Design a protein around this ligand. Structure first.
Ligand SMILES: *[C@@H]1O[C@H](CO)[C@@H](O[C@@H]2O[C@H](CO)[C@@H](O[C@@H]3O[C@H](CO)[C@@H](O)[C@H](O)[C@@H]3O)[C@H](O)[C@H]2NC(C)=O)[C@H](O)[C@H]1NC(C)=O
Ligand SMILES: *[C@@H]1O[C@H](CO)[C@@H](O[C@@H]2O[C@H](CO)[C@@H](O[C@@H]3O[C@H](CO)[C@@H](O)[C@H](O)[C@@H]3O)[C@H](O)[C@H]2NC(C)=O)[C@H](O)[C@H]1NC(C)=O
Ligand SMILES: *[C@@H]1O[C@H](CO)[C@@H](O[C@@H]2O[C@H](CO)[C@@H](O[C@@H]3O[C@H](CO)[C@@H](O)[C@H](O)[C@@H]3O)[C@H](O)[C@H]2NC(C)=O)[C@H](O)[C@H]1NC(C)=O
Ligand SMILES: *[C@@H]1O[C@H](CO)[C@@H](O[C@@H]2O[C@H](CO)[C@@H](O)[C@H](O)[C@H]2NC(C)=O)[C@H](O)[C@H]1NC(C)=O
Ligand SMILES: *[C@@H]1O[C@H](CO)[C@@H](O[C@@H]2O[C@H](CO)[C@@H](O)[C@H](O)[C@H]2NC(C)=O)[C@H](O)[C@H]1NC(C)=O
Ligand SMILES: *[C@@H]1O[C@H](CO)[C@@H](O)[C@H](O)[C@H]1NC(C)=O
Ligand SMILES: *[C@@H]1O[C@H](CO)[C@@H](O)[C@H](O)[C@H]1NC(C)=O
Ligand SMILES: *[C@@H]1O[C@H](CO)[C@@H](O)[C@H](O)[C@H]1NC(C)=O
Lengths: 134, 412, 185
């Protein structure tokens, strides 16, 4: 992060330098090749760069690649000043939503946690105020 | 009191959505190159791991906030090449391809007013956002193009094309006004809409306190960082503030006291900073959730909740982006010049008592008519606009009149 | 919190018994005080973190209560609140320290375009639909609802007359069928 790709070998060694070196806004990325295409996002990096395995592609030569964002599939509706699109069928759908409501209750004793059976610790801690009651 | 005219109004709302990501190194901030400081701080527990975890959680939470308010639809739409929306003029909101920036004139005006160093020092780093402005602009443009050519249908399933005047007629028949009002005063409505959308730039360009909400978080973060940095020049009840001089004019058996005191002071300062950051992030996330709800409800469909999506009867809304924030333009319908009238709960014909189907009875002074509840247009009472129920003996305040019959031609 | 007990906090040892043995009572109080301060501030941090988490948990619980009250015990017209699409019904289910909502919704399907017209101009009068819109197959004209395709013949019951064919834009020509034709017999 925030290290310009010349000082990187001034820090098991292949990842230090060589192979393919890419310079991005986040920093210097080593070990991935920068393709010229665009795909759906994956493990993010920053500044609209997601790196994905996606190397099923002259042997496949599985490797990690880096690419820019793709904001969904392109679409365009045919709009005129007289045109209506009326559905003719339908489809009942079911979706799920999860919501937490609570977590586990707990309680910790102030005196026992700090001082064990040693009454000396107890009467030394008694110097302080109501910190074991709040 | 029945209104006789109307007035299209446009209001603006500004909602913050995110705060700049940041991170600080626990060891570097407290101890510099001094390794003795490092292994003295090693006496304490995991106080240099909880803080980094909290900051990372805050950063990823801020990353998630933007995706909730701008990624409602995963299908970017394009406006038609020819703009013929029945006289309406969406030039101040749609993106302008002429300028190298892909923003709109209002977005360009907004980005030029947020304007108010700190490159790197003492382990202070600023992470870049995952989504750049060039893509938030694309999301906003897609959302804006979705409602213009498809209405609210694209927010529930496949996009359905619709003529804009017909969509506006749909929207009027959601608050009480019938369809013919728009099909009559199309020109007046279009002119009022154009004037209202034009006045927004003048309103924004003259008020410096309009964008006050977005500047508050930036100023608070800047002040917090400045205080954190300035806290490094305090002796904290020691002999000096720089570790180098402490290491020189003392003995290792004795110098540890100053190191320990400085470590304690800097650690508690960092604790205070982290707690303040968490508290601020809570409110920021609450505001982001509210903005997401507003985008989901006001934009992708008409909302009947009173005083939620603007002031007055809600008609439509438009989203716009801004640095770490969103701006909603609410287009609403409000009544106008009113008239005085007299009324009657029911009309008593021979025996039967008649109640209106929709609308109420208004009397000019000599005759009687039935009209809508939000626009004045008198009609003659017939057997289609009223229904009979009961007798003229239990209702209070009934009057006398004649109900016209529509089948008189059959007498011929 | 548990692992924090194994830190000397800048003292000679981390076990109180060892402090109490190889020292003097006039001198052993320093280590005890240092350990007390360290453990106290660690517990302070833990309590503050717990409070901050509990605030968010309460907020989520309130949202879940609102969702249960609105989506379950009645249909909701708020867009994208109770599921994606037109909301129909919902079912609750329990889960360890949480709730699960099953939203049953209605979405449209296969589509065919049509050509429309704001109004139909009969003799003099101009007719507007009561509910639904005018859809033209290409030769005839019909009126249909806005969410399902079922053409019907234009009559005097599906339309209402208001005005003249002079102010509206794009009005077209057609025949409005009359329902009292058999009366002629
Ligand atoms: C839809 O709205 C846009 C934006 O308002 C219209 O473009 C604007 O049209 C006005 C028309 O008066 C232009 O004003 C003229 O500018 C010239 C050159 O500065 C000046 O000599 C004239 O006296 C007049 O003030 C304006 O430049 C133009 N562009 C803007 C405002 O960016 C557009 O015309 C509207 N659509 C239709 C069909 O009218
Ligand atoms: C509206 O018109 C109706 C009918 O035209 C009025 O109903 C009349 O009410 C009066 C008293 O309220 C009654 O008239 C009486 O009828 C008896 C029948 O034997 C007659 O002996 C009396 O001398 C007197 O005329 C009766 O209920 C009714 N009359 C008729 C002929 O229907 C009603 O009062 C009118 N309301 C208003 C506000 O003008
Ligand atoms: C829908 O039907 C109306 C009514 O038939 C059509 O309106 C017709 O418009 C024409 C010219 O715009 C007019 O006809 C003229 O009438 C005068 C009357 O003196 C006559 O001298 C002229 O030679 C000419 O025929 C008139 O406004 C009207 N026609 C009639 C018979 O009243 C309208 O054009 C129809 N829609 C479409 C798309 O054709
Ligand atoms: C509205 O208020 C007026 C004023 O009190 C009412 O007029 C009176 O109504 C009583 C009830 O029958 C009559 O006895 C009086 O003679 C009326 N006074 C006048 C000056 O007309 C009127 O009835 C009220 N309206 C309704 C629907 O109750
Ligand atoms: C729908 O759009 C078309 C395209 O412009 C319009 O067709 C033109 O309308 C004008 C106005 O009367 C005529 O002068 C042209 O001759 C028409 N062109 C063609 C090719 O027919 C049409 O009027 C629009 N309809 C509505 C209701 O606005
Ligand atoms: C990184 O180093 C190269 C070569 O030294 C230099 O040209 C480049 O400008 C540096 N990066 C930045 C952001 O300056
Ligand atoms: C409204 O009611 C009548 C009009 O029908 C008029 O005589 C009366 O003075 C009006 N009241 C006010 C307050 O204008
Ligand atoms: C709309 O339907 C007509 C046939 O009624 C067809 O000719 C036309 O291509 C369709 N429009 C689009 C955009 O597919």
């Amino acid at each position: 992060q925030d290290v310009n790709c010349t000082e990187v070998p001034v820090a098991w060694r292949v990842y230090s330098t060589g192979s393919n070196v890419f310079q991005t806004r986040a920093g210097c990325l080593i070990g991935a090749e920068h393709v010229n295409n665009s795909y759906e996002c994956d493990i993010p990096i920053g500044a609209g760069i997601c790196a994905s395995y996606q190397t099923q592609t002259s042997v496949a030569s599985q490797s990690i690649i880096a690419y820019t964002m793709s904001l969904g599939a392109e679409n365009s509706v045919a709009y005129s000043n007289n045109s209506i699109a009326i559905p003719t069928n339908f489809t009942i759908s079911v979706t799920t939503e999860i919501l937490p409501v609570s977590m586990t209750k707990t309680s910790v004793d102030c005196t026992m946690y700090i001082c064990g059976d040693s009454t000396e610790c107890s009467n030394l801690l008694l110097q302080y105020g109501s910190f074991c009651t709040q | 009191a029945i209104p006789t005219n109307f007035t299209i109004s446009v209001t603006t709302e500004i909602l913050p959505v995110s705060m700049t990501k940041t991170s600080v190194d626990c060891t570097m901030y407290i101890c510099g190159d001094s390794t003795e400081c490092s292994n003295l701080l090693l006496q304490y527990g995991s106080f240099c791991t909880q803080l980094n975890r909290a900051l990372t959680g805050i950063a990823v939470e801020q990353d998630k906030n933007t995706q909730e308010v701008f990624a409602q639809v995963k299908q970017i739409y394009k406006t038609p090449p020819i703009k013929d929306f029945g006289g309406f003029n969406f030039s101040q909101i749609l993106p302008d391809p002429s300028k190298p920036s892909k923003r709109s004139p209002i977005e360009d005006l907004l980005f030029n007013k947020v304007t108010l160093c700190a490159q790197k020092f003492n382990g202070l780093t600023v992470l870049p956002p995952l989504l750049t402005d060039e893509m938030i602009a694309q999301y906003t443009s897609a959302l804006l193009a979705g409602t213009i050519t498809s209405g609210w249908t694209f927010g529930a399933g496949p996009a359905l094309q619709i003529p804009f005047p017909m969509q506006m007629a749909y929207r009027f028949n959601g608050i009480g006004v019938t369809q013919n009002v728009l099909y009559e005063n199309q020109k007046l409505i279009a002119n009022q809409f154009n004037s209202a959308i034009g006045k927004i730039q003048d309103s924004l360009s003259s008020t410096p306190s309009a964008l006050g909400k977005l500047q508050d978080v930036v100023n608070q973060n800047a002040q917090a960082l400045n205080t954190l940095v300035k806290q490094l020049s305090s002796n904290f009840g020691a002999i000096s503030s720089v570790l180098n001089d402490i290491l020189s004019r003392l003995d290792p058996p004795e110098a540890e006291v100053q190191i320990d005191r400085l470590i304690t002071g800097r650690l508690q300062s960092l604790q205070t900073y982290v707690t303040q950051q968490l508290i601020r992030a809570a409110e920021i996330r609450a505001s982001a959730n509210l903005a997401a709800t507003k985008m989901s409800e006001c934009v992708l469909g008409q909302s009947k909740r009173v005083d939620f999506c603007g002031k007055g009867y809600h008609l439509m809304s438009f989203p716009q982006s801004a640095p770490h924030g969103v701006v909603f333009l609410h287009v609403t319908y409000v009544p106008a010049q009113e008239k005085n009238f007299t009324t009657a709960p029911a009309i008593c014909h021979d025996g039967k008592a008649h109640f209106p189907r929709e609308g109420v009875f208004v009397s000019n002074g000599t005759h009687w008519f039935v009209t809508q509840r939000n626009f004045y247009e008198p009609q003659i009472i017939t057997t289609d606009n009223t229904f009979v129920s009961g007798n003229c003996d239990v209702v209070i305040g009934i009057v006398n009149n004649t109900v016209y019959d529509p089948l008189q031609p059959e007498l011929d």
